[PDB]
Amino acid sequence: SPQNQCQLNQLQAREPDNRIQAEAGQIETWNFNQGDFQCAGVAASRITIQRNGLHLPSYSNAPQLIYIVQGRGVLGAVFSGCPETFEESQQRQLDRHQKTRRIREGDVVAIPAGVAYWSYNDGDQELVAVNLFHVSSDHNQLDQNPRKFYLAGNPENEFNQNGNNVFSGFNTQLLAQALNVNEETARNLQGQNDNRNQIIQVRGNLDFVQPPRGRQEREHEERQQEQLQQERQQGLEETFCSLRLKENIGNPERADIFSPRAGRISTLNSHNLPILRFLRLSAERGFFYRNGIYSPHWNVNAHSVVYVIRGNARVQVVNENGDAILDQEVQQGQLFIVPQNHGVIQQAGNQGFEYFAFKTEENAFINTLAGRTSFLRALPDEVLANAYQISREQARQLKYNRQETIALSS
Amino acid sequence: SPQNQCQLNQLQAREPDNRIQAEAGQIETWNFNQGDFQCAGVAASRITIQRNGLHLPSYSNAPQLIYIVQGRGVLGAVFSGCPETFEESQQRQLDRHQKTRRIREGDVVAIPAGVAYWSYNDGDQELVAVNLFHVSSDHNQLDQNPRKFYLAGNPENEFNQNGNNVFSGFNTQLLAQALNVNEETARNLQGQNDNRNQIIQVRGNLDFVQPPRGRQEREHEERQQEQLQQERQQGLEETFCSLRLKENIGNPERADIFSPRAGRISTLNSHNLPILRFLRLSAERGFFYRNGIYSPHWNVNAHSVVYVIRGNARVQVVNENGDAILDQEVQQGQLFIVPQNHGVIQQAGNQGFEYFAFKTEENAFINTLAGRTSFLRALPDEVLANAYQISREQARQLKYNRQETIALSS
Amino acid sequence: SPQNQCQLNQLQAREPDNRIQAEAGQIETWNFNQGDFQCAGVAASRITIQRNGLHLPSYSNAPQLIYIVQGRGVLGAVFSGCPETFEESQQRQLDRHQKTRRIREGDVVAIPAGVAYWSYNDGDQELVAVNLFHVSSDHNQLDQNPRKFYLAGNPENEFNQNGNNVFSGFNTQLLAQALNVNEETARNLQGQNDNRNQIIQVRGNLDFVQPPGLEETFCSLRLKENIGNPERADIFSPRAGRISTLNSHNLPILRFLRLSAERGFFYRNGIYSPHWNVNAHSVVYVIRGNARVQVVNENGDAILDQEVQQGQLFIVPQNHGVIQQAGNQGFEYFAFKTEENAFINTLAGRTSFLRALPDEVLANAYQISREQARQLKYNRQETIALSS
Amino acid sequence: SPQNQCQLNQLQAREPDNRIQAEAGQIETWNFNQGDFQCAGVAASRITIQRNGLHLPSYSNAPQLIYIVQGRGVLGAVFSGCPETFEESQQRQLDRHQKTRRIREGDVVAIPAGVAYWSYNDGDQELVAVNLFHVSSDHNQLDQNPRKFYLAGNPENEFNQNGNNVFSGFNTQLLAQALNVNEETARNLQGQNDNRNQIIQVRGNLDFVQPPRGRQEREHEERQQEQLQQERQQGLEETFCSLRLKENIGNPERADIFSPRAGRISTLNSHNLPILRFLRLSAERGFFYRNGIYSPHWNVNAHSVVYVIRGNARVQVVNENGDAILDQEVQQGQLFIVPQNHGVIQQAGNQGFEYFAFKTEENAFINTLAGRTSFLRALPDEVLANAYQISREQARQLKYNRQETIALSS
Amino acid sequence: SPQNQCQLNQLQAREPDNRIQAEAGQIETWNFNQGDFQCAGVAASRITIQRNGLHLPSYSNAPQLIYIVQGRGVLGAVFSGCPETFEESQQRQLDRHQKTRRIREGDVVAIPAGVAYWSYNDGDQELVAVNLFHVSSDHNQLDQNPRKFYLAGNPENEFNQNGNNVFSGFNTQLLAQALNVNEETARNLQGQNDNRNQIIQVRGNLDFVQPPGLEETFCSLRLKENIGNPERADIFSPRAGRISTLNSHNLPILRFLRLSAERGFFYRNGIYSPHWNVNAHSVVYVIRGNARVQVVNENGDAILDQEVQQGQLFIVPQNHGVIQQAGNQGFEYFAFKTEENAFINTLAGRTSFLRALPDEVLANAYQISREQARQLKYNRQETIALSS
Numbered sequence A, B, D: 001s002p003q004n005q006c007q008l009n010q011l012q013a014r015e016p017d018n019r020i021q022a023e024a025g026q027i028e029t030w031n032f033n034q035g036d037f038q039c040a041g042v043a044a045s046r047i048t049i050q051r052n053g054l055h056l057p058s059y060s061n062a063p064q065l066i067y068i069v070q071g072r073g074v075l076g077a078v079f080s081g082c083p084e085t086f087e088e089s090q091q092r093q094l095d096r097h098q099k100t101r102r103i104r105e106g107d108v109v110a111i112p113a114g115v116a117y118w119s120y121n122d123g124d125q126e127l128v129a130v131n132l133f134h135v136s137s138d139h140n141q142l143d144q145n146p147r148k149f150y151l152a153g154n155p156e157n158e159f160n161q162n163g164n165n166v167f168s169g170f171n172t173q174l175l176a177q178a179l180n181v182n183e184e185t186a187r188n189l190q191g192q193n194d195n196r197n198q199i200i201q202v203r204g205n206l207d208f209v210q211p212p213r214g215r216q217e218r219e220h221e222e223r224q225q226e227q228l229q230q231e232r233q234q235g236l237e238e239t240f241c242s243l244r245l246k247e248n249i250g251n252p253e254r255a256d257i258f259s260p261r262a263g264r265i266s267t268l269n270s271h272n273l274p275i276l277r278f279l280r281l282s283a284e285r286g287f288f289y290r291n292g293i294y295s296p297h298w299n300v301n302a303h304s305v306v307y308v309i310r311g312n313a314r315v316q317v318v319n320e321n322g323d324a325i326l327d328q329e330v331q332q333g334q335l336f337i338v339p340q341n342h343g344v345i346q347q348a349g350n351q352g353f354e355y356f357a358f359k360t361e362e363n364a365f366i367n368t369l370a371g372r373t374s375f376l377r378a379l380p381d382e383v384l385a386n387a388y389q390i391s392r393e394q395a396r397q398l399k400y401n402r403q404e405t406i407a408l409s410s
Numbered sequence C, E: 001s002p003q004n005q006c007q008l009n010q011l012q013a014r015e016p017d018n019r020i021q022a023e024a025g026q027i028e029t030w031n032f033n034q035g036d037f038q039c040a041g042v043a044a045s046r047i048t049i050q051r052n053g054l055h056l057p058s059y060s061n062a063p064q065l066i067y068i069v070q071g072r073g074v075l076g077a078v079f080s081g082c083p084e085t086f087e088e089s090q091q092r093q094l095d096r097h098q099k100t101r102r103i104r105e106g107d108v109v110a111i112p113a114g115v116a117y118w119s120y121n122d123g124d125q126e127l128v129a130v131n132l133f134h135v136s137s138d139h140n141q142l143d144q145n146p147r148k149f150y151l152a153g154n155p156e157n158e159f160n161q162n163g164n165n166v167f168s169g170f171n172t173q174l175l176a177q178a179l180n181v182n183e184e185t186a187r188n189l190q191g192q193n194d195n196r197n198q199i200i201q202v203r204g205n206l207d208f209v210q211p212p213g214l215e216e217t218f219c220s221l222r223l224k225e226n227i228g229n230p231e232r233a234d235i236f237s238p239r240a241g242r243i244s245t246l247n248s249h250n251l252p253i254l255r256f257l258r259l260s261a262e263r264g265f266f267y268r269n270g271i272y273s274p275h276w277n278v279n280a281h282s283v284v285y286v287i288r289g290n291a292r293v294q295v296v297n298e299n300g301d302a303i304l305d306q307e308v309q310q311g312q313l314f315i316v317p318q319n320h321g322v323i324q325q326a327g328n329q330g331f332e333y334f335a336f337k338t339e340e341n342a343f344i345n346t347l348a349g350r351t352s353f354l355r356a357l358p359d360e361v362l363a364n365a366y367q368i369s370r371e372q373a374r375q376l377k378y379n380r381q382e383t384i385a386l387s388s
């Protein structure tokens, strides 16, 4: 019942449950029709893009946050009415297009609803992204189904239980009139005989106007990478048109919370990425070390939808009745929901625990139940003592025994 | 189902499903229980006020924009606890009331939810208005049904798909006491012997305190109409209480986009009319010339509910599957819905095409697939080549062969 | 003295102090370092553009409201980075440019600091406007001098008690490179051989493309409202007059600019109720008629007492009492107010400070009977425009 | 030099330096033309109103905060264009007026610039207020002089170091004409007869429409006062028109910081009083106990203008060169300036120290230099040790030796 | 003359004026009392921290932007009342502190007024930073003088063109009793025997907890963006140059601070299109290379005309026209802009002023043919960075 849609019996962490193959990669999707995805108002897909693969332009009815789990690419984003400021020099035969952005492992990229983007893998390894759609966004005025509207190709649509793109539904002769192009060129837009699906293979290098990398930025990128592996060991053009879409939230040095034997938390919200103001979304990226505990806590103003990047943790999620509706090891490649206000305790296993959480409110925050910053610490000893039937000595141990804030070292 | 209220498979442009007669005009409604009205979160109705017709005071649970299709009249909106600032001179037995607004062809007027207003046709021809209600506005805390609360008369519901007005439900003695007036008066409020419905005939002229034309001003409104008709052929009183409710969007000089052999579009949003920031609606008014093409596009952030004022167009609306869920010659007096993110193409008939669109978001905008501001121009040459399997030479014709922006000449 | 720039001793209403001539009209400025203009942080000028005159493109360090006093024309404001959406149809050799606006008598037009505009009189009668610059705007980061930077021609600078446009201080060759055009053309931009000043004569008629994402939002904001129209009044008494106000609740860009404006027409002997400006200075321009005006300071001293006439400007500083009575032909003015949502408090009328006080506080305050106190409240049954 | 007006050599606390006497009270003013008041852009006056005294209505070019240092009264502020909602029951010349506000010891009252108000003492003790004017407010577009514009009486100008209220400068015949009142009633407005100055003695009790006190608001204010005595031993009408103007910041229970042997601090800003957002002003009221210390601290975003209510303190204020530019005991009835960013330490003497601070920015805040939320405590131990040439143990003492936040005990 | 302070007759770009040698680094300063800095409302210092150098904690009354020109380092900024979230683990005399931030060449960092910070060079090369202070910021309620309030050391204050730190002005035993520490500890805070100045030498091996509700919102806000990184470009043309622009659409805190920046790299002979700053001043620091710069006022006079050089600073006042051509080795600069979301209007290229006007208004304005007009419009087919 949409009315009681969050009265959830059990919760499971789940792997994607359908794959779509394309000439140059794959898309896996977790079914959005499940009870817990509908509570959270989220849909999710994971995409892999092989070397020299091109994810075709599309836009969706839901805003999204895309976490780059692996690789290096280019994106791709189109701002309706902004001039093309990436242009070949005259000193029309020349290439020009709007700004193009480097993505890499650790980035989160915000794509507003109705904004079209493409991506390209120009790196050696596969580029893997998780795509989280806020279907419950007020920015989505359609319905609770995620949609992807494709602008090119003939895709197999990843959300649907003479052509498949938006051009393909226009009269071809009208469409050629509007473009001022021959009828055959317009048939090419309609992709009625394109067999490559949504991610296509580019022969030779894709050339576009692209500013150089590094080598000092290469230096910076390379240092980031070895630091993560060492850690797994223990007018208009200037303003609106060039807004920031992405932030690297997986850099170790970018921690907001950090205890060397416990873990790191990096948080992303309007105080970091201005567009999150508009989107009304937050994100978090943690790396808990061996046996690290994520201090138990509740989400005050959001749902948290957690993707396990690496490692495993044991996890309990408790509802208003004290029942642990989720209780399990959660493992790499899975997805689980911590509903708003439910409490949640997480302990890393022996290889650690990395996750990316997508939070369904602007400036999402938690309240902890343990640590230097806990609820228990805000109560008068005697309200503690009376509340729990305990000595004033014990009540002060509750308050001060854990001397860490959110990442608790065991 | 609410969860798929926007998975529409067919769509129609049509005229109103019902018609109500009253002493001095008529009210035609579209059924708001249609698939597409429910997906958009809108209700529409069309009002005809004859010479000396007074549409009785009412308010709605839903914000509306009223577009005036023909004629000239007076609108009186009432703002709670603002003082009367239109008053008969002392140099009570004198008339005084709130500011009266002159309405005419081309005006959009914004009425917030819960704000009572009345209108009157003091001009020559019939006064015709289209009313669009944002029923799924968050200003409407009731439910998905448009409601008209009448404060005078005994009307016929609209909106239905002794005494009917809000006074009529009060105990007649209490009300008379409350007003400090006799019972025959308080019963006259309750309107049980009123038989005229909601648009009543006024005897001789209605006299209220009204600023002169004048005249002087008479002439600019003339110079406009030999114009509108040629292209068809060849303290608190000063601030909150004086807010602008209206803007003329039908005037040819008001165009934001204009190509002489193609047509004109005028946009109305919160950078034009301040109260749209609060109501969260936009509007548009276009006039396409013979065979002009409204560039294929999608609505980024709103549905667009389109009222055809004159002429006709071939309209295709395309969903996420590439299927064209509307494909039709739209005519005068019909209304269709363009859902958010769906592709739309429109070519005017031989008599051009005139519409008013109501858009269900603040600062509603579109992205084009053809012209100088199109998504195609924003992509690198090779992403178009690779994407559509075409030559670089065909790529540049897709970018550059259409030199106009949104109103396209055939 | 800055810390006392508003300890003013005697105000007057006066016509402009200077006058500049050009080929196809004239610019009349008031002197901005009068004590009263310095106190308001305002500068004012009056432009008249003859049939077929083109006022050349320029921008200012200060935001302005322009009020159109008479005539009808066209205004071209330019916003950087916005596309051209007025374009000749195809089938480059085609004319293409930004949205063009009609101006006419009664229009108030908002021009932000740094935003270039030109205008052109394609009417019959002379086009007359008063330009009000808010020199002490937060948008002006230079200093308390109004500046006009011209982008075409060789103007005489209006703001002063081979050539002189911004192109002309650039290296002629550099500019020609930059524009990728020949030195010949680049020199025409610099305007050394130009003698027409800032308002030039167009031969034959000026033809531009004219109606008989961003493009729809930022790029097409409203710059104007017609405030002069009789039906537009917010306050109206038939024997007294009409006042129309313009602030952020009417024109969105006034939120950014932080200005308001007012337009009034008082009839024969009508009284603009005594009041004070709560949050702004009011700089008033007399369009027609005349009024007796007294402006009163914190000492009770009338620092202006004068019949004000057609063509004169005077300043009502913030918080000073003001009373105005129209003469026998009535009284028409435009007031420019230096705050967003400028408002007043009245001393007489349905909305007055006096009706707000309890009867006994009036009795005590003014040493009058309870009955005299109730006359002070209730004898004037109108709000702001009072009938003689 | 206004370019250098904050290069102060030698701050002193000072007592008022002019008194003005009136039929029913006095007004004392600190001269605004001295170095420190100019730096801060604040002017100050203190006003005493005897039993049944009426402070005549006035308004000022500067916003103000008024702290009620003693007594009980009534304040009427007038909101231009708001209707009179305090009215004699009809069950047409009866008493009606805008709402009336109780003021008492402890209240702060925000008065926007250009807004007129009057006060009346209806209690037994003298009513004493301190009035702090933000001359250098953006709301003041005149100049750096405070002004008071009186609407009644023939006041002596408290601010310049043929009646003379605002009415007295209008032609009397014109004035009587605007009001529709005989010419001798208009002369009474102009007050050239009035001998009483700005505070006048009402004869008999002043009657107005005033809601009762009882039965239990009385015993709340009772309890408030005995608790401070103990401490010293050990439509529109509903919204805009009825905005809140005062907060009681002076009672003990209202503390935001509180150490029982050190002191209490109560803070007042936009999070407490909504109008402070518009005014862009904050206040603080502290009571420090015997020998209590106010951790050294700098004001981050405001100047602080301090009025000593009672007791005394030793005080140092240190500029960017290390020189204490105020060093003295500051005493009851004095005023001192702590400019923005200057460091400041205060210790209460043997009787305590009570102050009201007026802060010239919205949401004003400090950074402490000692205690649980100090600067030193955010620095890494080793940066402490290197910065101060000290041991790791010493640095840990610096951080953790003081275990209170703002109000430190001896 | 504050009333007339932007009436600048002449301008120069120059290296710093003064020098303050310290133990482990130096701070150089351009003199904030010059005609043109007073106009912009900014003060500029350049600081170089040698290896293992620690710049001691200070705060200013002015908000600032710091551009890292070279090197690698850590910055600790302190947030009043935010918990210490970088803590050593248990199993207190464990280290514990507030978020520390890596800084590196091309990083811009925003330090609000009255916010205390320290920097430390833990890298190989010298850390080199330009500091721009917005003195005319509204956040500065003191006066038009940049102040530095040191919280440690006996600094030789860089802006004055028992020691001197804020602690050194309190009463030593009062201080000590507040701290609850001994009086000999407290006398160290006061830094009377500190010989080192404001950049001191470590001593190891500086060690801190470093990654190899409120804490997650306000307290973890973002202070820096890397604007020097080539892949960050917003405008890019391969033969001309790239430009990166920083404002509230990228860094949230700039909305509060009302500041913007820009980092450009012009390749050889590249032209920064002639333009004006619409809403701000830019203060330009030359990072490398050289350029022919001309800055033009409203009279049409180039008040700067110079080949600016590595390490020089110059000012382009609000609304003043500006053209720049990179030299033979090209041109890299950082620009500090004195308004939120600062922008320009170009005079050449696809988004120029000239493209916005009808062909015929250009023809008439400049007295050229309709076809020379189109040439001005369309001959340069780039936006901001122009190839030559």
Ligand SMILES: [Ca+2]
Pocket: A101, A243, A244, A245, A246
């Ligand atoms: Ca980005």
Ligand SMILES: [Ca+2]
Pocket: B101, B243, B244, B245, B246
């Ligand atoms: Ca209106």
Ligand SMILES: [Ca+2]
Pocket: C101, C221, C222, C223, C224
């Ligand atoms: Ca307009």
Ligand SMILES: [Ca+2]
Pocket: D101, D243, D244, D245, D246
């Ligand atoms: Ca109150």
Ligand SMILES: [Ca+2]
Pocket: E101, E221, E222, E223, E224
């Ligand atoms: Ca940061």
Ligand code: NA
Pocket: A170, A171, A172
């Ligand atoms: Na078809």
Ligand code: NA
Pocket: B170, B171, B172
């Ligand atoms: Na009944």
Ligand code: NA
Pocket: C170, C171, C172
């Ligand atoms: Na030259």
Ligand code: NA
Pocket: D170, D171, D172
């Ligand atoms: Na007189």
Ligand code: NA
Pocket: D372
């Ligand atoms: Na602690």
Ligand code: NA
Pocket: E170, E171, E172
């Ligand atoms: Na001492």
Ligand code: NA
Pocket: E350
């Ligand atoms: Na072009």
